[PDB]
Amino acid sequence: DYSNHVWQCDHTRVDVLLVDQHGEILSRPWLTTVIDTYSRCIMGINLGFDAPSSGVVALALRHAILPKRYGSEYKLHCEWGTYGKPEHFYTDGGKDF
DNA sequence: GTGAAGGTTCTCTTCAGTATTAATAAGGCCACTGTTAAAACGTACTATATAGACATCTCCACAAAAG
Ligand SMILES: [Mg+2]
Numbered sequence: 001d002y003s004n005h006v007w008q009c010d011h012t013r014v015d016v017l018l019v020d021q022h023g024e025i026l027s028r029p030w031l032t033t034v035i036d037t038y039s040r041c042i043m044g045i046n047l048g049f050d051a052p053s054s055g056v057v058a059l060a061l062r063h064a065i066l067p068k069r070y071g072s073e074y075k076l077h078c079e080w081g082t083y084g085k086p087e088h089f090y091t092d093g094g095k096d097f
Numbered sequence: 098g099t100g101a102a103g104g105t106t107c108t109c110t111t112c113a114g115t116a117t118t119a120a121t122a123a124g125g126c127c128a129c130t131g132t133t134a135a136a137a138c139g140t141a142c143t144a145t146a147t148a149g150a151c152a153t154c155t156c157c158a159c160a161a162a163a164g
Contacts, residue, residue, distance in 0.1 A: 011164075052164065094164045 006037040007086035009060060009097070011052045018049075032056055034064035037090070041082050044068075054096045 011032045018026040032046040044064030050056050068080040091097035 092164070093162095095162080096164085 001038070003036055003039045004084055004086050006088045006090050007043060007064070008035045008037055008090045009033065009057065010092055011056070011094075014047070030056070032060040034060050036082070043082055052094055052096045057096050 009032065011030050014029050014031050017028055020026055026049065029047055029049050030052060032052075033042060034044045035041070036043050044060055044062075044066075046056055046060040046063060048056070048059075065083065065085055067083040070076055070080070
């Protein structure tokens, strides 16, 4: 019925091969998204090599629930003015969830 | 004494006695009981002070399903 009423979360394998800072191949990361079902903002993400795990879920949840701050190395013109807790959380059946 | 031997009386004794204060006692053998300390000595209803065979809960490690 309103914003934050149901957040939704899932993970997927990003389709970019990453590299170490020394330049050698690192297998693709996983991306986790937390999404407002009303508003349809993306509320927060976690991007990393760690497989789908409750610590990864918790890491996306932290970013989503908390206010956002980014420095000038992020050349943003907008601002990611979204925060606050969900009232419900809607997921698939993964063992992390 | 000029010395020795011998003569003589002297009374009455109805008066004196009878009372306490009394010392622990002053008996010794025998045998035979029956108390009287008090010493020696079997064993009970207890009050504890352990020592250690067991039972228990807890923490950590392995096979089945979903994305
Ligand atoms: Mg999923």
